[PDB]
């Protein structure tokens, strides 16, 4: 009902702004000021002194199996849907859902209905249409119709290249899909991009290199993920940043890194190479199936773990925080997200000085307060 | 994006609350209080003393051809899409769009894309899927899929019964459509109703009477409109209020009333009969094709329906002694209740900041949609992309 | 891969057979004997003295939302898939999955793929095609194709009648669906029936009465469930048992009973009225959305709770056990299930004297042993 | 029923294990032991002394027209469905059915329904979806859906390349089909491979060579059959074994060999060249149309050529386990049938008892005798 006032917030917007008073109401950031705002008590829901603790935008996890992934090694490996608290307790206030390898038994209707479920439970959610294989799995007859007509659908993903599980897509198929995503993006104001799953194939980003050389499509339309899964792929991804693509680094748990880089190592290496960090995002692959050589699934907890690892190695908080917030909102054309700015959505984290999460606000409501869950999923 | 404070508002919520201070921010009503709120000037965009002038919710016009209607007497009669200001200048802050007789050349994609256009221009908009004829015109393969998956699609309409332009729908077809709308409504929290176009056919509401007698579908699922177009239909509509249906009265211009009641006469008559007015709504049929006649009855000119008839209706019934809150509810809270729009139709904390400021004669002075002024001292501050 | 021998089992098959030795191997019941079998130690995996404890068939829960149900009051009410142990720990060794009210966002491919997941994890699973609404939700173009070509698909359900959430199906639509299920059943040897969701509509079982009066379709094809949800419906369901239909009673938790009967009350009342109990089954509606006036979901735990309630009120164990085992296997044409008989699947419960479950065997493997889970779902912790 | 005990079995599993007692029950192999098991008579259905006769796994014939093939030279050449005994009497306890050249009048529904018919009659049966031509003949809208949702459907076949009767498939079409079979295989635990019909076209295995060089698809996904039909094709198939493909040799009758190798000659030649025999399978093309020569008379392929091949190569000095593996364990390994192709505890009780000359004396399928002392105990519903 009322206003929420956050006093002495050490604001990372994600760029450091210093101490501010932050006023929240109607699910929005209404003011960011040096002034010690004096308000009538009758209209204030919560008056909180953060006493110089860090305030950041909520994380945007743009690669999550919100329905659960798996199904790649038997039907029993179908992962259950990710409960609300497995996003919010880890600082994820916006998720972008996708289908992966199983786009056969799982449908775009499964995915979009779970987006609406997470929205009803008080977080923000979008999704990718099309999935992994060709022809694309869509709700309507085509990806272009899905993106034009369904507000939460922002692009095509995660479409597999250079992977034994791909549909062995041809150049002509890839640039047609990209053209449909791009046109739908222009018509709607949404991301109009193709989120590509990369495997360990030695062709790496060859299809995207050819698209950038031969077509007029803007480079931002080609968005490869898991680029840290092997070192030659990561090198090729870093080189292609100069052509204007955005690259997505996956926060693998330490077990699953194999012959590649952790998200932490990859981001530190991109910084050391002088890569444009504003073109680099990190995602968790939450709900993705995680085999042990027992069976588990990916968690959004690796995003904060990554942030702690790189900051402990001397990276500035704002550099890694941007890869989880403003950079994702910029690529995905989410102007209300990824920023502490007046008029933006009140999706906010309060961090301790070691960057542990103390509080999580989504759309102006506390989900986590003093490390305790206040709001949880319907069935948690 | 500061706060807006409206001081000394005579609040019709739509029920009269007396004088209040109303605080708006983030597109929402943040407070309604007796307190003379003192706020820091640095966070206040607008501090307005209404000095006891009436504040109401914005009107919800649940029957409008947002794409334009017509096409019923030649292709030249296709009405252009209704510009933003032809809603907002008349106090309409939420519209529900539909296709009418022409659901052949016009598509659900035309309709839904215009909903998104009106939302981008700063008003609120929803639509009906299915249209007028059988089989239904939908975006996906079925009405149930449209209502489940497309947030702005709230139900089926305007589906024609008792009209020479209908598809002569059978009872079994009607209750199947109603079942699909109802189930989709339960799944989504949306209206989940069938908005029925009534014509002058003497069968009147017989298909709805049969549905209420023979099925378990709740009465609110069957929502007839234009019930004032002839007197026997209006009498049957009033009688069926006791079974729990909502009825929609159309604010025809005075020319187009023919052998029926104006919206004003129909609402006054429902009140005189002791009908439950909370089950009665008024809509404009804006963007509907409006033929103009000479003294000889020859078709001379063509115009389209306007949302201006809603306020004209409110002025007419209040001049005849109806309480402002009774007619205002028929444009606001009753529509929001039937259509399950909990953010709309009410001056209540947490609701959308869709507000009208009225003069003493109930002329609109100011119109706010989602916390932004569209009309201020009778001047347009915000207009459609292509308005001049 | 040895033999398992269960000595001194007090066998309810589900009919009481007395004390027996039961031999299990290759997932099957190989012998039921008075003999104290002496076997070479080298081929015996497990030699267990049950010391006179009750041995029953595993329960067949023929009405479960294995994918999760809900979605009837907002997308947030989509129930997660039921984990393996939420069947096996409650004595359910065979489940028949279905879609309910949400047969729009959920597909037959969702349902059938979860059947295969539960089979991979070591229980037995089947499903109903078609769902709740008309037209039917199927994997192939028609229910008849689904039942003919997909081994686990046994019939059509749960198809809604006398309910505000139904598709307001017409008699002609219902008997066409029934004819397709019946023909597919004859071609395949499978159930070939229509499992009908009943609501609180006052028309009750009128469409089924009309089908029995006007068509040649056998009565067993028309299988109404939730018949205990209101008392006039339950009375009509009991009267129609004399025409040869089977009725399914839902084991609602005590909160959700409203103006109807608990499964326990309904089964005791059917027995008191002299109804043919072999035509009565009980199911849990596991994974179904359960509102509090908070949100929870249905559990297979109500089946054993029902068995304890009716036995405490004087019903013979074999009467209620048949409603969970042999009666379901008979109606659904599952000849390997619902019975302790040689050649049948080794799906077995060991009960304490108060009928608490001590051990659960599915296809010859222990899932529960001395009330500890030995086998669990892929993602259970 | 209770337990069956087979005493003094000379076990080829298919590798030689020596003399064993084999215990069967519930359709499974429950024990393989040196112990002379003593069991209570009340639980024993059958106590059989094999007297040192050879015991092998049942043959897996992974290329059979279970519906009948033919239709390539007029409608009258449609072969009738193969009766149960025309598998079991020849030692075939598992068959994998397919459509061939006529995937126009014959459907995947014909094929899958005959799989279920053979299962009802007590043998094991699977099938290939898609058939010979492009676009594919499937039950559902796609091969990937067929393999994901229909338990008996294990892959795509028999898809024609280098043949005048092919659909002239392009590289891009072939690798798309292979990707769909592979992904469906991973999702289900099933074979997930493309079984390719090879003709006499001089392009031979060019499309598969290109797939192995240009894609990440595992080599095992590309499974060419009839590789013995001409000598240059057979040489190319043998060379590609080093890239990890499995190759299927067809047991043509002696008449039909033309300018190629018999299965026997092909397997002996692969052994002489030091090829990895575990990557080589033999299939009969049972139910395939067999014209007799001017075209004078018409017959159909029989599973009898599998055992004839085994007798031919063993008479030329090949070890029984080498050729037996090509009919049993190698097929079960490629097709991901862990219950088949092996005498191992927990496996299906699909067993052959052979005489000293390797003639079949007894055939057990899923623990039941189909053939006992060379007499049929079980036959098809309509066999007389
Ligand atoms: Zn991926
Ligand atoms: Zn992934
Ligand atoms: Zn109308
Ligand atoms: Zn109209
Ligand atoms: Zn149910
Ligand atoms: Zn139900
Ligand atoms: Zn062939
Ligand atoms: Zn061939």
Distance D97 CA to ligand 7 centre (A): 10
Taking CA atoms, what residue in A is nearest to C115?
A75
Q: Which residues surround ligand 5, an ion (CB under 5 A)?
A: C 100, 285, 288
Query: Is the Cβ–Cβ distance between A69 and A312 less than 8 Å?
Result: no
- Which one from A285, A319, A345, A359 is the annotated catalytic residue? A285
What number of CA atoms fall less than 13 Å from residue D12's CA on the CB side?
24
CA distance D40 to chain C (A): 7
Distance C16 CA to ligand 3 centre (A): 70
CA distance C233 to C241: 13
Query: Is the Cβ–Cβ distance between C302 and C263 less than 8 Å?
Result: yes
Query: Is the Cβ–Cβ distance between D326 and D284 less than 8 Å?
Result: no
> What angle do the packed helices B324-331 and B308-319 form, to 10 degrees?
160
Q: Max CA-CA distance within chain D? A: 64
Q: Are residues C148 and C45 in the same domain?
A: no
The DSSP annotation for D345-377 comes to: TTSB--EEEE-TT--EEEEEETTEEEEETTEES
Q: Are residues C300 and C177 in the same domain?
A: yes
Q: Which residues surround ligand 4, an ion (CB under 5 A)?
A: B 100, 285, 288
Q: Are residues B106 and B7 in the same domain?
A: no
CA distance A54 to A27: 20
Query: Is the Cβ–Cβ distance between A87 and D199 less than 8 Å?
Result: no
CA distance A226 to D367: 50
Q: Tokens at residue B121, please?
A: 């221009």
The DSSP annotation for D201-216 comes to: -TTTTHHHHHHHHHS-
What number of CA atoms fall less than 13 Å from residue D230's CA on the CB side?
12
Taking CA atoms, what residue in A is nearest to B148?
A113
CA distance D188 to chain A (A): 5
DSSP 8-class letter at C39: -
Q: Tokens at residue A261, please?
A: 């880089």
Residues of A with CB under 8 A from a CB of B: 1-3, 23, 25-28, 30-31, 33, 35, 37-40, 42-43, 109, 112-113, 116, 120, 139-140, 148-151, 188-189, 342-343, 364
Considering only the beta carbons, identify the residue of D145, D179, D187 that sits closest to A168. D179
CA distance A262 to chain D (A): 24
Query: Is the Cβ–Cβ distance between C262 and C252 less than 8 Å?
Result: yes
CA distance B31 to chain A (A): 6
Q: CA geometry: angle at C296 spanning C293 and C297, to 5°? A: 125
Mutate to test the interface with B, among A6, A34, A44, A149 (most CBs of B within 10 A): A149
- Do chain C and B touch: 3 or more Cβ pairs under 8 angstroms? yes
Query: Is the Cβ–Cβ distance between D143 and D184 less than 8 Å?
Result: yes
Query: Is the Cβ–Cβ distance between A331 and A191 less than 8 Å?
Result: yes
C100, C282, C299, C300, D104 from C252: Cα distances, Å: 16, 10, 9, 10, 53
Distance D263 CA to ligand 2 centre (A): 46
- Which one from C285, C319, C347, C359 is the annotated catalytic residue? C285
C-alpha dihedral, D329 to D333 to D336 to D337, nearest 10°: 10
Looking only at the bridges linking them, the beta strands covering A348-351 and A295-297 are: unpaired
Looking only at the bridges linking them, the beta strands covering C193-198 and C222-225 are: parallel
Q: Are residues A121 and A244 in the same domain?
A: yes
CA distance A73 to A70: 8
Instruction: Give the number of domains in chain A.
Output: 2
Q: CA geometry: angle at D167 spanning D162 and D169, to 5°? A: 70
B190, C121, C289, D367 from D189: Cα distances, Å: 43, 13, 33, 25
Q: Are residues A51 and A70 in the same domain?
A: no
Q: Tokens at residue C70, please?
A: 């809900």
CA distance C297 to C77: 10
Q: Are residues B71 and B140 in the same domain?
A: yes
Considering only the beta carbons, identify the residue of A28, A30, A40 that sits closest to B35. A40
Q: Which residues in chain B have their CB less than 8 angstroms from residue A150's CB?
A: 149-150
Task: Tell me whether residue D47 is one of the annotated catalytic residues.
Answer: no
Whether residues B25 and A27 touch (CB distance < 8 A) is answered with no
Enumerate the β-bridge partners of residue C29.
Answer: C24
A307, A368, B48 from A12: Cα distances, Å: 14, 19, 35
H or E segment at D265?
A: helix D263-272
CA distance D372 to A110: 54
Q: Of D129, D126, D131, D125, whose CA–CA distance to D144 is shortest?
A: D129
CA distance C359 to C58: 10
Q: Are residues A78 and A226 in the same domain?
A: yes
DSSP 8-class letter at C304: H
The DSSP annotation for D147-172 comes to: HHH-TTEEEEEEEEESSTTS----HH
CA distance C183 to chain D (A): 15
Whether residues A296 and C379 touch (CB distance < 8 A) is answered with yes
CA distance B297 to D258: 94
Distance B209 CA to ligand 3 centre (A): 19
CA distance D16 to B157: 77
Q: Tokens at residue D362, please?
A: 């007894």
A12, A29, A30, B215 from A21: Cα distances, Å: 13, 11, 11, 58
Q: Are residues D147 and D296 in the same domain?
A: yes
Q: Which residues in chain B have their CB less than 8 angstroms from residue C71's CB?
A: 187
A204 phi, psi to nearest 5 deg: 50, -125
Non-local (6+) Cβ contacts of B13 within 8 A are B32, B57, B346, B347, B348
- Which one from B163, B285, B352, B366 is the annotated catalytic residue? B285
Query: Is the Cβ–Cβ distance between C198 and C207 less than 8 Å?
Result: no
Chains that touch D (3 or more CB pairs under 8 A): A, C
Considering only the beta carbons, identify the residue of C75, C113, C379 that sits closest to A295. C379
SS (H, E, C) A224-238: EECCCCCHHHHHHHH
Q: Which residues in chain C have their CB less than 8 angstroms from residue A117's CB?
A: 74-76, 78
Query: Is the Cβ–Cβ distance between C96 and C154 less than 8 Å?
Result: yes
Enumerate the β-bridge partners of residue C10.
Answer: C19, C54
Q: Are residues D2 and D118 in the same domain?
A: no
Q: Tokens at residue B82, please?
A: 């209704």
Q: Are residues D295 and D355 in the same domain?
A: no
CA distance B149 to A140: 10
CA distance A280 to A284: 14
Q: Are residues C68 and C134 in the same domain?
A: yes
Distance A64 CA to ligand 2 centre (A): 7
> Where do the H-state alpha helices sit in D215-319?
231-240, 263-272, 304-315
B69, C339, C340, C373 from C6: Cα distances, Å: 79, 16, 12, 19
CA distance D349 to D94: 12
Range of the domain at D362: 1-58+338-384
Question: Hey, how many other C-beta atoms are within 10 angstroms of the C-beta on B198?
Answer: 29
- Determined by X-ray
> What angle do the packed helices A231-240 and A206-214 form, to 10 degrees?
20
Q: CA geometry: angle at A58 spanning A54 and A64, to 5°? A: 140
What's the helix, strand, coil split of chain B in %, to 5?
30, 30, 40
Distance C256 CA to ligand 5 centre (A): 13
The reply to whether omega before B135 is within 30° of 0 (cis) is: yes
Q: Are residues D286 and D379 in the same domain?
A: no
Looking only at the bridges linking them, the beta strands covering C16-25 and C3-12 are: antiparallel
Whether residues D172 and A170 touch (CB distance < 8 A) is answered with yes
What is residue B276's three-state secondary structure? coil
C-alpha dihedral, A64 to A67 to A69 to A74, nearest 10°: 180
Query: Is the Cβ–Cβ distance between A219 and A189 less than 8 Å?
Result: no
CA distance D372 to C201: 62
Query: Is the Cβ–Cβ distance between D330 and D246 less than 8 Å?
Result: yes
Here the contacts of B295-302 (C-beta below 8 Å, separation 24 or greater) are: B302/B70, B302/B77
- Do chain D and A touch: 3 or more Cβ pairs under 8 angstroms? yes
Q: Which residues in chain D have their CB less than 8 angstroms from residue C44's CB?
A: none
> What angle do the packed helices B231-240 and B263-272 form, to 10 degrees?
50
Q: Of C83, C33, C14, whose CA–CA distance to C376 is shortest?
A: C83
Q: Tokens at residue B271, please?
A: 């009140």
User: E strands of A50-152, at which residues?
Assistant: 54-57, 59-64, 92-97, 124-130
């Amino acid at each position: 009902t009322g206003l929420t006032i956050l006093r002495n917030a050490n604001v990372y917007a994600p760029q450091p702004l210093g101490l501010k008073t932050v006023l929240v109401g109607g699910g929005k950031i209404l003011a960011i000021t040096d002034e010690a705002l004096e308000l009538p008590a009758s209209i204030v829901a919560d008056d909180i002194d953060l006493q110089g603790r860090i305030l950041t935008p909520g994380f945007i996890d743009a690669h999550a199996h919100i329905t659960g992934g798996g199904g790649e090694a038997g039907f029993a490996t179908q992962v259950p849907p990710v409960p609300l608290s497995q996003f919010t307790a880890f600082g994820v206030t916006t998720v972008v859902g996708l289908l992966g390898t199983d786009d056969t038994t799982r449908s775009t209707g499964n995915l979009l209905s779970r987006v609406y479920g997470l929205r009803e439970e008080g977080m923000s959610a979008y999704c990718w249409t099309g999935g992994y294989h060709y022809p694309l799995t869509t709700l309507m007859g085509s990806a272009r119709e899905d993106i034009v007509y369904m507000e939460p659908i922002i692009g095509v993903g995660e479409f597999a290249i250079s992977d034994h599980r791909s549909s062995q897509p041809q150049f002509e198929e890839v640039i047609r899909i990209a053209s449909d995503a791009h046109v739908a993006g222009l018509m709607t104001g949404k991301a109009g991009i193709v989120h590509f799953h990369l495997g360990d194939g030695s062709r790496k980003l060859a299809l995207i290199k050819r698209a950038l050389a031969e077509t007029e499509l803007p480079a931002r339309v080609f968005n490869p993920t898991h680029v840290n899964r092997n070192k030659p792929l990561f090198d090729e991804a870093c080189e292609m940043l100069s052509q204007g693509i955005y690259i997505d680094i996956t926060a693998f748990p330490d077990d699953a890194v194999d012959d590649g880089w952790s998200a932490a190592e990859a981001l530190l290496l991109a910084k050391e190479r002088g890569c444009p960090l504003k073109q680099i995002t990190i995602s968790s692959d939450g709900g993705g199936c995680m085999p042990a050589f027992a069976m588990d699934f990916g968690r959004s907890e690796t995003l904060l773990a990554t942030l702690k690892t790189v900051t402990a190695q001397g990276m500035a908080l704002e550099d890694v925080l941007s890869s989880l917030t403003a950079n994702v909102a910029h690529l995905l054309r989410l102007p209300a997200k990824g920023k502490i700015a007046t008029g933006a959505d009140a999706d906010l984290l309060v961090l301790d000085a070691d960057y542990s999460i103390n509080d999580v606000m989504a759309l102006g409501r506390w989900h986590l307060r003093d490390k305790a869950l206040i709001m949880k999923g319907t069935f948690e």
